[PDB]
């Protein structure tokens, strides 16, 4: 049986998680994906809007 979700690996975010894929519920055939990445000591959360 698969490992249990790590406690800090949040299942849902409302408005260790580095490099992890998050996504909004698809709507209007448009998909919105997100993730936070690191460049040296700078972090950026990128959202991509893709039909």
């Amino acid at each position: 049986s698969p490992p249990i979700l790590p406690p800090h690996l949040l299942q849902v975010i409302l408005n260790v998680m580095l490099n992890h894929l998050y996504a909004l519920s698809i709507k209007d055939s448009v998909m919105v994906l997100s993730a936070t990445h690191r460049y040296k000591k700078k972090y950026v959360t990128t959202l991509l809007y893709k039909p």
Binding site: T45, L47, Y49
Partner: protein, 289 residues
């Protein structure tokens, strides 16, 4: 010059916040969803990703939203309603190569790049990963220069008045009256390619300011007056930030940075507008000393 030496000795990376958000649009995205995504995310520009070419190809900013709204308004009067389902790629086709900068490039290169290309948005793109890291602005740069440069040695010109330096624009100032429709504002924006318009009265006294930024609030109606549109003023407003010709570069730079606006309205004793001093003028003057 101290500014020139500082800019040349620092990388763009140094300007990047510890944490930020970046919004990217696939160019197949419909324009109407693109601009609703800007508003929702409270962002003013978005890199464009061309999936077929597998690379960034341009930027989508508030200026484009304004171009498109203006076109939409005119076309509608002639029963043309196509801009709706337009994809970003198709609207780009209807009509500016991507200009970007590596995080390892100097601050000097960043500034030159913004001035030379007459843009307000400069994506910092890592050549190794290919990722956009951050979007650089005039505002961010000036704040950084003000914060990280020692007060002394202080260049003599920092103590010179606007009158002496002749920084900014003092002729043909695009302005609107309080009784001016939003759609007339758009036409002025599009024609003059100017980031904001002072709102004056009968005698020419500034009483408000209408920025390109105050327009995108409308993607979340173009008939209302400029005054009426500036009532959904989301942020606490103390009135119009202005300056006088006798004031020094130093005082003006300090005012700009502390207030975090893109320009001041130059005015006389009677609050009559005489010119504009923008971060564009400031940064240019500093890069040419």
């Amino acid at each position: 010059s101290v500014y020139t030496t500082f800019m040349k000795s620092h990388r763009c990376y140094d300007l990047i916040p510890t944490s930020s958000k970046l919004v990217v649009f696939d160019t197949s995205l419909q324009v109407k969803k693109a601009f609703f995504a800007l508003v929702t995310n409270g962002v003013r520009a978005a890199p464009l990703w061309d999936s077929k070419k597998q690379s960034f190809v341009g930027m989508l900013t508030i200026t484009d939203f304004i171009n498109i709204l203006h076109r939409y308004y005119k076309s509608a009067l002639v029963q043309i309603y196509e801009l709706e389902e337009h994809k970003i790629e198709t609207w780009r086709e209807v009509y500016k190569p991507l200009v970007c900068i590596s995080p390892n490039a100097s601050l000097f290169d960043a500034v030159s790049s913004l001035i030379r290309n007459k843009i307000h948005r400069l994506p910092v793109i890592d050549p190794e990963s290919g990722n956009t890291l951050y979007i650089l602005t005039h505002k961010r740069i000036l704040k950084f220069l003000k914060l990280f440069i020692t007060e002394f040695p202080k260049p003599e010109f920092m103590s010179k008045s606007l009158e002496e330096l002749q920084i900014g624009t003092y002729a043909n100032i695009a302005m609107v009256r309080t009784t001016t429709p939003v759609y007339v504002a758009l036409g002025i924006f599009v024609q003059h390619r100017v980031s904001a318009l002072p709102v004056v009265d009968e005698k020419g006294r500034v009483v408000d300011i209408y920025s390109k930024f105050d327009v995108i609030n409308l993607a979340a109606n173009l008939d209302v007056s400029v005054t009426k549109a500036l009532q959904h003023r989301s942020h606490y407003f103390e009135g119009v930030l202005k300056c006088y010709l006798h004031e020094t570069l130093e005082a003006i730079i300090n005012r700009l940075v502390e207030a975090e606006v893109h320009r001041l309205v130059v005015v006389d004793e009677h609050d009559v507008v005489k010119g504009i001093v923008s971060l564009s003028d400031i940064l240019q003057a500093l890069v040419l000393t």
